[PDB]
Amino acid sequence: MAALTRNPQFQKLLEWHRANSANLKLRELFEADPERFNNFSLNLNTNHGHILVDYSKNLVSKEVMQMLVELAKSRGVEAARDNMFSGSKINYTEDRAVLHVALRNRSNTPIKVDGKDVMPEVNRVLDKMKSFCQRVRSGDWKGYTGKSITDIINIGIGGSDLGPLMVTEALKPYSKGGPRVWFVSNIDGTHIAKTLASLSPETSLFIIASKTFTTQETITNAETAKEWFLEAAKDPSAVAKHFVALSTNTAKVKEFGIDPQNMFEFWDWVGGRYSLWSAIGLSIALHVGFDHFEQLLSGAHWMDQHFLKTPLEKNAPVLLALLGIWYINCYGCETHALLPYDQYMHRFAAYFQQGDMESNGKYITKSGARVDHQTGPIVWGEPGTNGQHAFYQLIHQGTKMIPCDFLIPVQTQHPIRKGLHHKILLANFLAQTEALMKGKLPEEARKELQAAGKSPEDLEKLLPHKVFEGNRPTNSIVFTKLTPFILGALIAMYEHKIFVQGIMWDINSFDQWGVELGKQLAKKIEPELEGSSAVTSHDSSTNGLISFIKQQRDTKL
Amino acid sequence: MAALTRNPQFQKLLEWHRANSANLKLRELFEADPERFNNFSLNLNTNHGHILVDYSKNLVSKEVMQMLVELAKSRGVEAARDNMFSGSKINYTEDRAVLHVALRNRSNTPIKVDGKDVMPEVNRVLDKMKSFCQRVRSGDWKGYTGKSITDIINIGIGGSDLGPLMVTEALKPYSKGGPRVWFVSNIDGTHIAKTLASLSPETSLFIIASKTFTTQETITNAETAKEWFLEAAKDPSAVAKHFVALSTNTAKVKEFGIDPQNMFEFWDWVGGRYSLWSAIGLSIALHVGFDHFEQLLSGAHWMDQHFLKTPLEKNAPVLLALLGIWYINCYGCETHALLPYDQYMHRFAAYFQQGDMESNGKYITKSGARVDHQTGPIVWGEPGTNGQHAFYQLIHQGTKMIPCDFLIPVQTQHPIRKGLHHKILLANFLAQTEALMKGKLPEEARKELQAAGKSPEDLEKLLPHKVFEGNRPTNSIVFTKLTPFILGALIAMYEHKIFVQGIMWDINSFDQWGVELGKQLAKKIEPELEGSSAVTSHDSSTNGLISFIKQQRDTKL
């Protein structure tokens, strides 16, 4: 077996689930205990707003929570956490530290890697970012014709794209006085082409986000951008005015035409999917200003300290992680839905698809043994209320159990019509989790059908269709306002949730060996597509698809 | 029990799966049979491009496919299809026809509901759409100060939002000369506020899209837009120059204050999630032109005819449906990933979240029996290569089985860098399904590590992490180019896939009773949010969350 399944606290939990989970009914749990909300929620005061983590609408009793906390302890969560924070090389397959927490370590307490404090270098790069932000935002940094920069274009993939995109989208109201920001990520030529179409080479600055500065899709996009730029500027020395790098590859950066002074460094202990807090967040700082970026870091730091200092039984990321374990390893739920009732947060779910799924979509444990249990879930979701009119039909009346996190700010950034829109938004946020829990009983639906004037025959036929079984569990995460600080705390909270789950599963949340095979095979296919010759080097499907491509690419429609 | 589970062909299939499925190995299937691609793919010639549906990388043999087709016949798929196309009231809980196929019936062969041909009214509304599009796009239609329209704003949610948004995004290259299009859907005031901030009341045309014309989000947004407009125009007669309605509800459209000549009608037999083909598609036609809209309809019509006339064994939507049944009801896969390698198609997956999940997220059958089997899957995805660098780690090396549809056009709309970007995009499209199929054996990974110069200790430690188990099934759907016609065919193909699955499960794909409870409970909560007094009328969680909102809404941040 594996570490988790051999653990006696896990075995006890699974045994309890087998014998008792059918007796867990949300309606009954609330009726039996008026203190349920009080006992199954955390009201966190950050001093910059409150975050309420209400986990009371979950299929758990006091005893279940106790068993879950005991399991976290006996899986080594507390020790593993302290090891991360101290710079221990917990990314064991790559022999690397895991120190996104250092990037936002506002206290500046030394954190050592190989006996050396990383904080001076973290702060040196932050200082460089601040200076660059002043130069660009003030208009002092001039393009090749002497004009101020109006547009920033981040070119990067995965961890170099999703974070900056999600955060600038979420913090749009804080971008007054900032340049417009654009994100190019797909190798699909559509992405860069449609972006460049709306830009002037005179006033556009490109940020090339790549640690190695050899990333294929990113560098291809970067080179396309440079070609477009040079068509107008006709001067290779002008590239330094319009291109900067988030990288450590000084030689390659200089080769590209970028001034090495404008290379913003980060470190091997910064995972791509944990990198927005580093130099990778430069586009955030440019867009909303460095002050707001520091606030984002500070919110994450607050949550880091919460995670570090708080007993497990009232520790927010730990409890979220444990509820996830309960649903994944005991109920067997494949997915986890993130449903923010906030249009600004429209890329939040997509961000945590990488954060969660690339971290914990794993199957080999620390010992090298294959797991004999489930690991990371499929993360998905769309903002409310839109989801209600798209897929909530399935959540309410389908055949899947789907743990959902509902998220909302109390205060809106746009209190139009004396708060009418936000009142309705809040009402829907509250109603949906209430509905998911309560359902609608036959006696309730029957009276509605009778009042609607349905015949006895029609009523009988329609009745089961109108019944909601309910008992569908949710978390509700409510926060004062979606400020840079609060957003930072929320992202960090989920980062640590993912960490806790990874430790409990005995997997490495911080490597990504599963991307290698696709990369290898793509490099082999690339040169085969050129020219008219038949490709026979693969399986018949791959060959057949290539044949179709070669036959169809010249057809005039 | 239910119709599917009681069916002897289904029980035979399930028994076969139990006894034989573990012996299905994709790598070996391809090695043993050079004709595999040829035997498990459909190359459809539409005369306006080809669509290759390659299902050969699925965990199926000839025997499995035979059993699946026999099951479709035993479940009465052909008769049910014919009933849909003939105007029979197959939406049995609402006693309605299901006639999205009539909307795009280019042949104009009569389709009767209640003994009356629907085609004259379908065509009357299309003619009205054509005339209106000509007037607006030409610049002839003037706003209240006498200026041409520059911006179109669709206000609607769910079925009245997702289709037009997805299609205008996918067909962006065909929008040159057309007005800018905006989509407002969320009640969240951010959505309308940020849209209106970028617009002038003088040159903006609002399209209020709602089947019922009573949806709270849509009517509230519409009223907010009207108030903003009238603050500038100060003349109720000016509304007729700036507001049109797409609806079935003439009375409510009139009540809102829109001229009947500004109403584009559709019918009760047009489901919201099947409505883009109707008047609801007005924003598409305005953006890309009515000619391109007609091409979209024509593509759907081609696929409708394919579905209607083709033997099941060679019928694309039927085969896709059956493969889905195989994975859902035999393998127990919760999800289905849609992965278009096309940035323009970035909202395709989101569209089919509604299309699939709202249709087949059901639990009551035609006989009134509760299902004792799985129904509709959770649909999700992001376009390649973006999804590729986010979550494919889990697809390759997690603990979930995830059927994936990979989609790509052979010809790009933007063949920049002499086709370099598209070459890389195609290579990745091909490599990923190859990688998912093939995997990488321990001995293959061992040789790679040996060649890398790894010590025996370092090799043994890393080895298991580098293994890819493979045997992960995919469909590859490749088409000549993403034109309006081909897009129409692709959407219709999935519509019919969803239909076939619904018939086989004995559920109603065309109602949506599961959205009612949330609406009811939100109406009750709305007035409770007003004032500072505590709410005690709900469960303690709902009460506690309301208390938090009331306590936090006045804090300065």
From Swiss-Prot, chains A, B:
Residues annotated with N6-malonyllysine modification: 454
Q: Could you say what a knockout of this gene produces?
A: Embryonic lethality caused by impaired gastrulation. During early development, the egg cylinder fails to be divided into the three cavities, suggesting a deficiency in extraembryonic mesoderm formation resulting in the failure to form the amnion or chorionic mesoderm.
Q: Hey, which pathway is this one from?
A: Carbohydrate degradation; glycolysis; D-glyceraldehyde 3-phosphate and glycerone phosphate from D-glucose: step 2/4
Q: Name one Pfam family in it.
A: PGI
Q: Which GO CC terms are listed, alphabetically?
A: ciliary membrane; cytosol; extracellular space; myelin sheath; plasma membrane
Q: Which reaction does it catalyse?
A: alpha-D-glucose 6-phosphate = beta-D-fructose 6-phosphate
Q: How does it assemble?
A: Homodimer in the catalytically active form, monomer in the secreted form.
Functionally, this protein is described as follows: In the cytoplasm, catalyzes the conversion of glucose-6-phosphate to fructose-6-phosphate, the second step in glycolysis, and the reverse reaction during gluconeogenesis. Besides it's role as a glycolytic enzyme, also acts as a secreted cytokine: acts as an angiogenic factor (AMF) that stimulates endothelial cell motility. Acts as a neurotrophic factor, neuroleukin, for spinal and sensory neurons. It is secreted by lectin-stimulated T-cells and induces immunoglobulin secretion.
Q: Which family does it belong to?
A: Belongs to the GPI family.
Task: Report the protein name in the record.
Answer: Glucose-6-phosphate isomerase
Q: What is the lineage of its organism?
A: Eukaryota, Metazoa, Chordata, Craniata, Vertebrata
Q: What is this protein's gene name?
A: Gpi
